[PDB]
Write a protein that binds this ligand. Structure first.
Ligand code: HEA
Ligand SMILES: [Cu+2]
Ligand SMILES: [Cu+2]
Lengths: 50, 201, 122, 70, 62, 70, 129, 57, 83, 70, 83, 100, 115, 115, 55
C-alpha cells in the first residue's frame, strides 16, 4: 500500500488488523500488509483531519 | 519632426506613368481601336484582366458571394452530383472544413491590402504605402499555464542521439535499434521540422 | 551572453546604452520585460533632476555662510561650487545606477527567456 | 459548418485550372471519348499534384500576407 | 456617361498590350536581352490587324 | 456560384476543343469537326469529373482534426 | 477498414489515428518571439540518413561480434563525440543560415564530413577494437 | 483592383511553379512540396527584383 | 563568425585587383616572405611603420572585427595619450 | 482614371516580370535563393524590355498612323 | 453546380462580354500560331495571300462552332435554374 | 454623438465599396464584415491654428476645475484619448457651413 | 453586514477627486444611493403591496440610531427564534478556524488554507 | 528491475528512488519519444506493435512514485521536454567529484570476468 | 604607443603576409561586412501538409 496525503497528514488505523499507516503529503509510504485471516474490519482516522 | 522630409513623392500614378513596363496610356485611338457588340452599360465596368482570375475579381465585388450556405445547400459540383456519392460529399465537406479553403472576406481584404502594399514597396518604394504608426510587438505569453509551454531558445535543427544500450535483456540482445538495412543502429539523427510550432503535452 | 569573470573587461557605457536600446525595441523582448524597462526609465530621471536641483539650492546657501561670505573671489567660487558638484554627482550616479541595475535585471529576464545562460536548466 | 459563395467560386476556378493543366499534360483530348488506363492514372496523379499545389500556393499567399502584417 | 466607350477603351488598351506581350514572347531570345524592336513593332501591327478581324466574331453578347 | 461561372467554363472548354481540333490543323469546318468537338467535350467532361473526384478526395484525405467518428 | 471493425476495434483505430495525429493539432499554436529557422530540406535529411546508414552498416560487424557492452558503449561514445562535433558545426551553420542555398551547402558539408573523415576515424577505431 | 492584381499575381506564380515542378507529372512528396514552395519564393523575389530594376534601376 | 562561400563577396580581392604592379603585398601574393626584424637597431627602424601598416590593414581588412577593434582602440588610446 | 491606369501598369509589370523570369529561368527546385548571376540576367532582360517599351512609345508617339481603327 | 443569382443582370452581361473578348484573344493567338503569322523571320507587318486565306478559314471555323459549342456545353452541364 | 450633417452618397463604382488603400475607408453600405461597417461623411471648412492661453487675454483654463478658456489641443486630445495627439496639437479646423 | 459594505459608495470615490464631470456623475438615477433595500426574508402573497419592508425592525427609526454609539451589530444578534437542534446542522462554516493541540501539527498548523 | 530498489532501500519513503526512476524514465522517453507512433506499440499496424523501449522503466517509475508526485514530476518533465535539454547538454558536475576505481580510463579492463 | 601598436601590427602584418603568400584573397573569418552587403533572411516558410504515417 502506497500511503499518501492530499492536504494534511492523515492516519488510517485499522484496529482489528492492528495497523496504523500515516499517509503524509509528499511521502509515498510503501507499507506491506499481510492479512493471515479472512474478515471485515472497520476503522477511523487516527490523525485529526479537521 | 519625423515627417520633416519623410514623404516627398505622393502622386504614385505620376510614377506609374513613368516606370511602368507598358506603352503610353494616352492613345486616343485606344478609345475606338476595335468594334464590339458592347450593348448597354449604365454603370462603370472595370476590365478584369487575366484569363484565369478575371471573374474572381467580380467575385470579390459582388456582395452575394459572401453568403454562407450549409453543406446541404451546396450539394452539387460543376460536373458531378455530390448527393449520390456519400464518400465524395464527405471529401468535399473536409475540403471545405479547412480554413485556408474557406477563408472569410475580412481576411481576404486584409490580405489584398497587405499584398498591394508589398507590391508598391517592392516595385516603386514610394514609402507612402507603408504604415504610418510604428507597432511594437510583445509576446505576452503567460508562463502560469500547465497546458501551454513555450520553448526557451529553440530546438537545434539537427541532434545526434545514441540509443540506450543494455536496456533490454529479454533475449540477451543488447542491440535494440536496427535499421531497415538490419545493421545495428548506434546513432540516430533527430531533425526539427517546424521552428514556430509548439509541442503537444 | 556577456563574459563572466573578474579578468573579463567591465561593461562599457556605450555597451550599456546599446543594450538598453535593444531591450527597448527588440522583437524578441517580452511584454513584462518591456514594461519593467519602461517603468525603470520613467522614475530614474526624477532622482537625477532632483539631485541637480538640490545641489543648486544647497550650494547657494553655502555661498552666504558666515565664513564663506568674506573670502577671496576664487576661494568663494570654489567653496560655492563644492556642494553643487557633489550633489550633481549624487543625482547622476543614482539615476544611472538605477537604470543600469534595472537594465541588468531585464537582460537577465530576457536571457532566461532566450535560454542563453549555461548551467541554467530547469 | 457553412461556406461562402466566394469560396465556392474560388474552388471552382482552382478546379478549372487544375483540370486544364491535367488535360494539357496527360493529353486527355487525344481520345475517343474514354480515357485510357494510362490517361486515367495520369489524371489522378496530376489532380493530386494540382490539389497539393493549390493548397501550397494558398498557404504561401496567406503566409506572405501574415509576414507583411506580422 | 459613356460607360460603353470607357469599357471599349479599357478593352482596346488591354488587347494592344496583350498583342505586344505576345509578340515580345515570340520574338525574345537568348534568355531575354535579344529581341528586334522593328520586328516587334511589325508583329504588334499584324497581331492588331488579326485581333481586329477576329473582334466581330467573338467579342459580342450571346 | 452563378451561371456566369458555367459560361466561363464553357468558353474555356470551347477554346480547348478548338485547340484539340484546329490547334495544328487549320482547315474547313465540317460534320467531322463537329463530331471531333463533341468527342473532345465528352473527354473534357470526364476529365473534369475525374479531376474533381481526385482533388476532393486528396483534400478530403488530408487530416485536419482528430478522428472522432462519434 | 473502420466499418469492418467492431466497437472495440474501431475505438482502437481511432486511438491510434489520434495519437499519431497529435502534431497536426500542435501545428496550430505558435509563439511569435521565437527566432524562426528555415527547416532542413527532405533531400538533405535523406542524404544524412544514408550516411548514418552507411556508418551503421560499417559498425554492424564489430558491434555484432563484440561480447562486451562496455566495449560497444566505448566505440559508440567515441563515434558519438566525433559525429557530435561535426553535427554541432553543421547545426551552427544551419541556425544562422539565411537561404536555401546556405542550407544545402551546410548539408553537403556535413554529409561529406560524415562520408570522408568519419570513415577513416571509424576504420581506425575498428582496427583498434 | 488591388484584389484583382493580387489574384493575377498569385495565378501567374501558381502557373509558373506548376509548369516547372509538374514537369515529370509524377507523385509529389514532402521534398516536392518544399521544391514548389522554393519555386514560388524564387518567382516572388524575381518579380520584385524585375519591378525594382524597371523602376529606374 | 563565418561568411558562407556562396555569400562571401571577395572585396579584399577587389582591393587586390586595384593595387599597383609594384605592390609588396603582390610580391607577398607572389610569395615574398616578410619577417619582423629581430635586430635591436633594426627593430628600432621598424618602430616608425605602425601607422602605415594600420592604413594598409584598414585598406585590406575593412570588414574584419579584429581589425576594426584594433583600429578603434588605437585611435582612442592615441587621443587619450595625447590629451 | 488613376485606378485603371495603375491597374494596367501593374498588370503590364507583372506580365513583363513573368516573361523575363521565364526567359531567365529563375525558378529551380534546388533552392529558392536567386543567384547573383540570375539577378544579373534578370536585370539585363528587364533593361532590354524597358528600352524596347521606350522605343515603341517613341515610335507610336511620333506617328499615330501605326495604330489605327481596325 | 451549387448555382445562385450573385451577379446582377448587367453584371452577367458585362461578364459574358469580357469572357467573349478573352476567348477571342486566345483564339486570335491560336490562329496566329496555326497560320505562322508569329514567325520570327517576319519581314513585315503584313499577311500574304496564304496567311489571309488561313485567317479567313480560322475565322469561319470559329464562327461555325461558337454558338453550337456554347449551347452543347450548357446542355451537358445542365446547370439548374436559380430560384 | 448627434449628427451635424447628412452623410455622403455611395459611390457608383462597386470597386469603391472597399477599404481605401491609404484612408482605409470602406464606402460599402452593406459591408460583409459588420465589424468593418463604416458610414463616412464629407465636411468642408476653414483651418484655424491652435489658440494660445493668455492671462492678459483672459484665457485661463482650469482643466482640473473643468473651466475652459483656451483652445488646448493637447488637453482635448488627453481628454478624448486621441491617437494622433501630435498631429492634433499641430493645428485645428474650424467647421464652416455654406452660409445659413 | 449590509452596513459594513463600503464598496457600495465606491463610485462616489471616483467623483471625490475628479470634479471635472462630477455634476454629470450626479445626473444619474438613484437605485441604491444612500439606500439599503433588503430582499424579502419571507413569502407574503398579499397583492395589496407592490413591495414589503424587509428592513430590520430595530433599525426602522434611524433617529434612534443617531445617538447610540454602537454599530449595526445590535440588529444582527438574537433577533429570531428559529433553532434547529440537529447534530447535522452547521454552526461554524469556518473549517479552517481550529487549533493544532499541544503539539502544533505541520503543515496543518502552518498554512492559511488548512489553519 | 532496471532501477534497483536496493539503491535507496534503507529509506522508508521512496523519495530519492522515485526521483532517480523518474530521471531515468524521462531520459529514455526523450531518447525514444518521436518514434513511438512510427516504430513502437503506438503504430497503426497492430501486427507490427513493438513494446516501447521505456515500458519497464515507466512501470518501475509508476510503482516507485505516487500519484501526486508522479503528476508534478510529469509537469516538470513536460517543461524539460519542451526545453529539449538533454542531461548531457548541461552536465559539468563530473569534474568536481573525487576519482574512483570505477572511473578508470580502460573501463573494459576494469571488469575481471571468470567462470 | 610604438611598443604596443608595433607588437600588435607586427602580428597583424605577419598574418597578412601569410595570407597573401597562400594567395588567400578572402576576408578574415571574423569579418563583419556592411548592411548593404548582407543577405536578408527569407521569412516565408510554409510547413508541409500533415499526413498520417502508414506505419
Ligand atoms: C499537566 C497537564 C495536564 C493536566 C493536569 C491534565 C488533566 C486532565 N486531562 Fe489532559 N492533556 C494534557 C495535559 C493535562 N491534562 C495535554 C498536554 C493534552 C494534549 C493536548 C493535545 O491533545 O494536543 C491533554 C489532552 C487531554 C484530552 C484529550 C481530549 C481528546 O483528545 O479527545 C482529555 C480528554 O479526556 C483530557 C482529560 C483530562 C482530565 C479529564 C484531567 C483532569 O485531571 C483535570 C483535573 C484537574 C487538574 C488535574 C488540575 C488540578 C486542580 C488544581 C486547581 C490543582 C491546584 C491545587 C494545588 C494548590 C496543588 N486531557
Ligand atoms: Cu483523517
Ligand atoms: Cu482524521
Amino acid at each position: 500500500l502506497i500511503t499518501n496525503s492530499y492536504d494534511i497528514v492523515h492516519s488510517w488505523f485499522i484496529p482489528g488488523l492492528g495497523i496504523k499507516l500515516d499517509c503524509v503529503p509528499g511521502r509515498s509510504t510503501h507499507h506491506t500488509f499481510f492479512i493471515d485471516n479472512v474478515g471485515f474490519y472497520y476503522g477511523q482516522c487516527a490523525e485529526i483531519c479537521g | 519632426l519625423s515627417l520633416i522630409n519623410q514623404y516627398k513623392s505622393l502622386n504614385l500614378s505620376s510614377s506609374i506613368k513613368h516606370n511602368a513596363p507598358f506603352i503610353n496610356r494616352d492613345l486616343y485611338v485606344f478609345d475606338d481601336l476595335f468594334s464590339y457588340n458592347l450593348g448597354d452599360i449604365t454603370t462603370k465596368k472595370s476590365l478584369f484582366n487575366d484569363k484565369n482570375s478575371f471573374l474572381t475579381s467580380y467575385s470579390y465585388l459582388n456582395n452575394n458571394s459572401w453568403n454562407n450556405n450549409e453543406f446541404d445547400l451546396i450539394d452539387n459540383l460543376p460536373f458531378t452530383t455530390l448527393f449520390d456519392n456519400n464518400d465524395l460529399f464527405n471529401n468535399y465537406k473536409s475540403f471545405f472544413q479547412d480554413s485556408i479553403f474557406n477563408s472569410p472576406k475580412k481576411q481576404l481584404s486584409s490580405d489584398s491590402k497587405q499584398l498591394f502594399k508589398h507590391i508598391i514597396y517592392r516595385s516603386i518604394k514610394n514609402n507612402i504605402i507603408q504604415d504610418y504608426t510604428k507597432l511594437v510587438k510583445h509576446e505576452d505569453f503567460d508562463e502560469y499555464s500547465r497546458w501551454i509551454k513555450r520553448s526557451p531558445g529553440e530546438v537545434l535543427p539537427l541532434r545526434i542521439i545514441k540509443y540506450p544500450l543494455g536496456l533490454e535483456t529479454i533475449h540477451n540482445n543488447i542491440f535494440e535499434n536496427t535499421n531497415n538495412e538490419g545493421n545495428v543502429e548506434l546513432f540516430r539523427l533527430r531533425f526539427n521540422s517546424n521552428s514556430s510550432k509548439m509541442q503537444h503535452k | 551572453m556577456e563574459p563572466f569573470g573578474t579578468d573579463e573587461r567591465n561593461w562599457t557605457h556605450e555597451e550599456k546604452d546599446i543594450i538598453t536600446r535593444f531591450l527597448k525595441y527588440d522583437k524578441h523582448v517580452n511584454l513584462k520585460t518591456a514594461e519593467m524597462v519602461y517603468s525603470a526609465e520613467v522614475e530614474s530621471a526624477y532622482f537625477g533632476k532632483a539631485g541637480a536641483l538640490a545641489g543648486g539650492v544647497i550650494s547657494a546657501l553655502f555661498f552666504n555662510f558666515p565664513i564663506v561670505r568674506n573670502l577671496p573671489i576664487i576661494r568663494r567660487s570654489v567653496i560655492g561650487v563644492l556642494p553643487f558638484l557633489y550633489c550633481y554627482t549624487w543625482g547622476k550616479n543614482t539615476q544611472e545606477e538605477l537604470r543600469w541595475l534595472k537594465t541588468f535585471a531585464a537582460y537577465q529576464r530576457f536571457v532566461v527567456y532566450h535560454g542563453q545562460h549555461c548551467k541554467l536548466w530547469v | 459548418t457553412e461556406v461562402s459563395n466566394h469560396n465556392y467560386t474560388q474552388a471552382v476556378a482552382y478546379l478549372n485550372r487544375a483540370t486544364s493543366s491535367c488535360v494539357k499534360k496527360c493529353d486527355s483530348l487525344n481520345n475517343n471519348g474514354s480515357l485510357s488506363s494510362k490517361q486515367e492514372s495520369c489524371l489522378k496523379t496530376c489532380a493530386e499534384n494540382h490539389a497539393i499545389a493549390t493548397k501550397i500556393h494558398a498557404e504561401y499567399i496567406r503566409k506572405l500576407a501574415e509576414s507583411k502584417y506580422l | 456617361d459613356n460607360y460603353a466607350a470607357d469599357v471599349q477603351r479599357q478593352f482596346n488598351r488591354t488587347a494592344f498590350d496583350s498583342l505586344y506581350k505576345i509578340c515580345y514572347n515570340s520574338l525574345v531570345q537568348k534568355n531575354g536581352s535579344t529581341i528586334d524592336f522593328q520586328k516587334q513593332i511589325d508583329c504588334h501591327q499584324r497581331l492588331i490587324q488579326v485581333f481586329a478581324k477576329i473582334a466581330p466574331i467573338v467579342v459580342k453578347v450571346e | 456560384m452563378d451561371p456566369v461561372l458555367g459560361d466561363v467554363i464553357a468558353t474555356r472548354i470551347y477554346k480547348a476543343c478548338f485547340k484539340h481540333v484546329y490547334g495544328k490543323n487549320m482547315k474547313a469546318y465540317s460534320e467531322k469537326d463537329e463530331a471531333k468537338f463533341d468527342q473532345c467535350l465528352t473527354s473534357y467532361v470526364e476529365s473534369y469529373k475525374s479531376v474533381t473526384n481526385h482533388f476532393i478526395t486528396y483534400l478530403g484525405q488530408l487530416p485536419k482534426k482528430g478522428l472522432s467518428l462519434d | 477498414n473502420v466499418e469492418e471493425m467492431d466497437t472495440i476495434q474501431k475505438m482502437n483505430y481511432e486511438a491510434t489515428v489520434n495519437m499519431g495525429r497529435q502534431d497536426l493539432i500542435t501545428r496550430e499554436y505558435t509563439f511569435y518571439s521565437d527566432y524562426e529557422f528555415i527547416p532542413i530540406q527532405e533531400d538533405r535529411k535523406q542524404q544524412m540518413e544514408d550516411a548514418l546508414n552507411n556508418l551503421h552498416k560499417i559498425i554492424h560487424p564489430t558491434v555484432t561480434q563484440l561480447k562486451k557492452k562496455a566495449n560497444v558503449q566505448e566505440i559508440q561514445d567515441r563515434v558519438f563525440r566525433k559525429l557530435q562535433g561535426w553535427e554541432g558545426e553543421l547545426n551552427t551553420c544551419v541556425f544562422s543560415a539565411k537561404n536555401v542555398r546556405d542550407s544545402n551547402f551546410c548539408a553537403d558539408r556535413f554529409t561529406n564530413r560524415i562520408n570522408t573523415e568519419g570513415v577513416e576515424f571509424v576504420k581506425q577505431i575498428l582496427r583498434e577494437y | 483592383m488591388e484584389q484583382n492584381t493580387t489574384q493575377v499575381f498569385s495565378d501567374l506564380a501558381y502557373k509558373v511553379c506548376f509548369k516547372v515542378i509538374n514537369d515529370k507529372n509524377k507523385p509529389f512528396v514532402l521534398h516536392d512540396e518544399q521544391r514548389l514552395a522554393n519555386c514560388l519564393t524564387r518567382y516572388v523575389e524575381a518579380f520584385n527584383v524585375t519591378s525594382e530594376y524597371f523602376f529606374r534601376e | 563568425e563565418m561568411i558562407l562561400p556562396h555569400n562571401n563577396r571577395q572585396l579584399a580581392r577587389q582591393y587586390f585587383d586595384s593595387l599597383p604592379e609594384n605592390d609588396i603585398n603582390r610580391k607577398y601574393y607572389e610569395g615574398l616572405k616578410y619577417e619582423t626584424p629581430k635586430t635591436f637597431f633594426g627593430r628600432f627602424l621598424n618602430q616608425f611603420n605602425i601607422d602605415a601598416k594600420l592604413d594598409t590593414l584598414s585598406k585590406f581588412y575593412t570588414y574584419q572585427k579584429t581589425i576594426r577593434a584594433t583600429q578603434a582602440e588605437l585611435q582612442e588610446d592615441r587621443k587619450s595619450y595625447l590629451t | 482614371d488613376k485606378r485603371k491606369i495603375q491597374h494596367e501598369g501593374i498588370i503590364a509589370l507583372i506580365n513583363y516580370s513573368t516573361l523575363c523570369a521565364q526567359k531567365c529561368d529563375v525558378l529551380k527546385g534546388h533552392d529558392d535563393k536567386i543567384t547573383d548571376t540570375e539577378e544579373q540576367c534578370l536585370r539585363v532582360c528587364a533593361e532590354k524590355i524597358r528600352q524596347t517599351f521606350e522605343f515603341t512609345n517613341d515610335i507610336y508617339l511620333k506617328n499615330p498612323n501605326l495604330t489605327k481603327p481596325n | 453546380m451549387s448555382t445562385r443569382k450573385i451577379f446582377d443582370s448587367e453584371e452577367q452581361s458585362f461578364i459574358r462580354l469580357v469572357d467573349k473578348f478573352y476567348l477571342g484573344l486566345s483564339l486570335t493567338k491560336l490562329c496566329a500560331q496555326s497560320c505562322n503569322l508569329l514567325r520570327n523571320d517576319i519581314s513585315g507587318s503584313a499577311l500574304t495571300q496564304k496567311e489571309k486565306d488561313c485567317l479567313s478559314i480560322c475565322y469561319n471555323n470559329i464562327e461555325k462552332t461558337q454558338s453550337a459549342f456554347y449551347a452543347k456545353v450548357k446542355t451537358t452541364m445542365n446547370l439548374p435554374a436559380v430560384e | 454623438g448627434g449628427e451635424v450633417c447628412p452623410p455622403m452618397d455611395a459611390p457608383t463604382d462597386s470597386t469603391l465599396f472597399v477599404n481605401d488603400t491609404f484612408t482605409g475607408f470602406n464606402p460599402d453600405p452593406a459591408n460583409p464584415e459588420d465589424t468593418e461597417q463604416v458610414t463616412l461623411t464629407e465636411i468642408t471648412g476653414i483651418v484655424r491654428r491652435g489658440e494660445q492661453q493668455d492671462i492678459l487675454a483672459r484665457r485661463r483654463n482650469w482643466n482640473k476645475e473643468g473651466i475652459y478658456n483656451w483652445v488646448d489641443l493637447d488637453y482635448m486630445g488627453k481628454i478624448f484619448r486621441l491617437f494622433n495627439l501630435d498631429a492634433i496639437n499641430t493645428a485645428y479646423i474650424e467647421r464652416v457651413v455654406p452660409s445659413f | 453586514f449590509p452596513f459594513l459594505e463600503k464598496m457600495k459608495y465606491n463610485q462616489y470615490k471616483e467623483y471625490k477627486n475628479d470634479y471635472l464631470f462630477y455634476l454629470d456623475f450626479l445626473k444619474k438615477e438613484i437605485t441604491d444611493d444612500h439606500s439599503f433595500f433588503w430582499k424579502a426574508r419571507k413569502v407574503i402573497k398579499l397583492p395589496q403591496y407592490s413591495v414589503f419592508s424587509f428592513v430590520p425592525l430595530k433599525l426602522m427609526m434611524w433617529k434612534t440610531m443617531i445617538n447610540y454609539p454602537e454599530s449595526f451589530w445590535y440588529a444582527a444578534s438574537r433577533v429570531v427564534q428559529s433553532r434547529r437542534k440537529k447534530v447535522f446542522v452547521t454552526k461554524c462554516s469556518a473549517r479552517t478556524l481550529t487549533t493544532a493541540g499541544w503539539t502544533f501539527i505541520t503543515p496543518f498548523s502552518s498554512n492559511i488554507k488548512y489553519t | 528491475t532496471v532501477v534497483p530498489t536496493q539503491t535507496f532501500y534503507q529509506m522508508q519513503d521512496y523519495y530519492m528512488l522515485c526521483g532517480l526512476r523518474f530521471e531515468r524514465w524521462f531520459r529514455c522517453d526523450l531518447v525514444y519519444h518521436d518514434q513511438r507512433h512510427t516504430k513502437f506499440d503506438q503504430v497503426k499496424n497492430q501486427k507490427n506493435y513493438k513494446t516501447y523501449p521505456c515500458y519497464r522503466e515507466y512501470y518501475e517509475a509508476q510503482y516507485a512514485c505516487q500519484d501526486d508526485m508522479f503528476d508534478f514530476l510529469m509537469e516538470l518533465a513536460y517543461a524539460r521536454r519542451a526545453a529539449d535539454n538533454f542531461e548531457s547538454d548541461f552536465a559539468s558536475h563530473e569534474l568536481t567529484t573525487l576519482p574512483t576505481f570505477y572511473d578508470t580510463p580502460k573501463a573494459a579492463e576494469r571488469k575481471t570476468y571468470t567462470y | 604607443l610604438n611598443q604596443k601598436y608595433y607588437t600588435h601590427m607586427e602580428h597583424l602584418w605577419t598574418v597578412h603576409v601569410n595570407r597573401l603568400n597562400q594567395k588567400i584573397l578572402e576576408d578574415p573569418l571574423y569579418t563583419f561586412y556592411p548592411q548593404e552587403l548582407n543577405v536578408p533572411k527569407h521569412n516565408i516558410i510554409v510547413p508541409t501538409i500533415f499526413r498520417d504515417t502508414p506505419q
